[PDB]
């Protein structure tokens, strides 16, 4: 037999700022948001749910500097909490 | 120690794993058995350019996400300097790729210079736009184009600059 | 003296269906994803941050029906959770 | 009992907003004093339309959603059947408001047709489209054009139709 299914389920994505708005680059160091989602993922990973490690990464932004910028959470239907059981 | 699979990621214990089965019920994502799954992740980061600045410092990136997404579990597939239709292209195969039936998750990694409307691709100009929307990522990998992904987490994530403000403004104390 | 702040921050959208698709309404019952807000505020306010709560009503249409749709969150700048404190 | 402010909505209790305090740090945002705080809330809702179907049932949705961010503490403006520019109009106002300097968050309410652009205005028609964008919203609650709300909550609740597509794509067992 046939089942229906949601089209569009269980997504999330993040951009690196705000529509409109620039986001940055170091020509030795790489990009920031980019570096700053790999230390929040190597940290947080383990305890925390995708979701939450995007928020952290967000308040890591909150103190705009000379090159500021607010990562974006965008099109969210994750329906539960996705844990990435590192280890496991 | 960093030696192992995960390398830098810190590791999820088992009694961890046990106190978050416990604080949330039934609603967290299934995670296939590790002996079984074949997870995968795709990143897509363009560096050189026709007629757009060279995006310097990217090879770090690209590292740094492939290293991550190895650490935690996902087999990487690096592609790089495409246009927007190679970009759809290799997003449509990728979403053909047999190993999302015996996986629990994907991760998409978009890395590239970006405008309001979306994702530039290489052959990007204002004369000549050369555009990947954020809505066809989507398209491409929801249930209709993507039947093996069904009720599978999919991670979009996108480095790029989406319009010229430097997304400031001043206040006073 | 003047001081930075991001253009955008602290929002959090929450739609009732994804992008191309159809929400449904009860001509006498009311919108569903609106009942459905109110029922998951009531309840879980008292516990949970607003995305939280977000995600607990897109759970709750995780089965498709005769008129299914999938809420959406869209565009996050939070930077901290949001908990309403009802009651205080 | 429902009998106070706050309606069916069940209480935090002391120590559970202790908890709260605790189990995550300074991570939360700040609540102001009950005793000063003039919290806001604007619900636009659109039920009658000059050329698209009559939105029956709205006046539940009207009921239950002011009724319970008034129970959660916000004074709410009710405004009904606008065109696009009506709404931009009572945006702008509600983002001039002198309450939101002593206020800690915000709450927005849209209730009416839609199509992918957006909110259909009172006068939408395939011919002469009446449309208020998403975007729009979100940049006259920004730090630009209400800096009252910068490092508040700023929530948006929209129940609208976003497209004519049903949602679901067919699977067998
Ligand atoms: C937008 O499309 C891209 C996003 C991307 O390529 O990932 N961003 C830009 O093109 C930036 C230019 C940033 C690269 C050049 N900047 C530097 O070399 C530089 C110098 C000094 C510093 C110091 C600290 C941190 C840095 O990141 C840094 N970078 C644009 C900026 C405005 C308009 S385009
Ligand atoms: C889209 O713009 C709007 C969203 C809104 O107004 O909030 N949605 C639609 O116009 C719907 C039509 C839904 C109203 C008419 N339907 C009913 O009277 C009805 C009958 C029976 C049931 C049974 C269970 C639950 C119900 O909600 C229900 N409703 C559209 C649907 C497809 C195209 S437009």
């Not at chain 2, 990694?109 to 530039?120: A, L, N, Q, T, Y």
């Not at chain 2, 000549?128 to 491409?140: E, G, H, R, S, T």
């Not at chain 2, 249930?143 to 319009?163: W, Y």
Request: charged fraction near 25%.
């Amino acid at each position: 037999a046939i089942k229906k299914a949601h089209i569009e389920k269980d997504f999330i994505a993040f951009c690196s700022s705000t529509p409109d708005n620039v986001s940055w680059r170091h020509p030795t160091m790489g990009s920031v948001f980019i570096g700053r989602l790999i230390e929040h993922m190597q940290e947080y990973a383990c305890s925390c749910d995708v979701e939450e490690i995007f928020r952290k990464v967000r308040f890591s932004f909150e103190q705009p500097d000379g090159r500021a910028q607010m990562p974006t959470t965008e099109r969210v239907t994750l329906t539960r909490c996705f844990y990435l059981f590192p280890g496991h | 120690t960093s030696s192992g699979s995960e390398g830098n990621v810190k590791l999820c214990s088992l009694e961890e794993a046990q106190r978050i089965w416990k604080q949330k019920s039934a609603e967290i994502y299934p995670i296939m058995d590790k002996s079984s799954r074949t997870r995968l992740a795709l990143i897509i980061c363009n560096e050189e350019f026709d007629s757009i600045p060279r995006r310097t410092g990217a090879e770090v990136d690209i590292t740094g996400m492939t290293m991550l997404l190895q650490n935690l579990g996902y087999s990487v597939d690096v592609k790089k300097n495409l246009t927007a239709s190679d970009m759809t292209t290799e997003l449509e195969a990728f979403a053909h790729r047999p190993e999302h039936k015996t996986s629990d998750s994907t991760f998409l990694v978009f890395m590239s210079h970006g405008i309001r409307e979306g994702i530039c691709g290489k052959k990007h100009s204002e004369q000549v736009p050369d555009i990947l929307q954020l809505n066809a990522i989507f398209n491409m990998l929801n249930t209709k184009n993507c039947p093996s992904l069904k009720d599978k987490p999919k991670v979009i994530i996108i480095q790029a600059c989406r319009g010229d403000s430097p997304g400031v403004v001043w206040f006073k104390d």
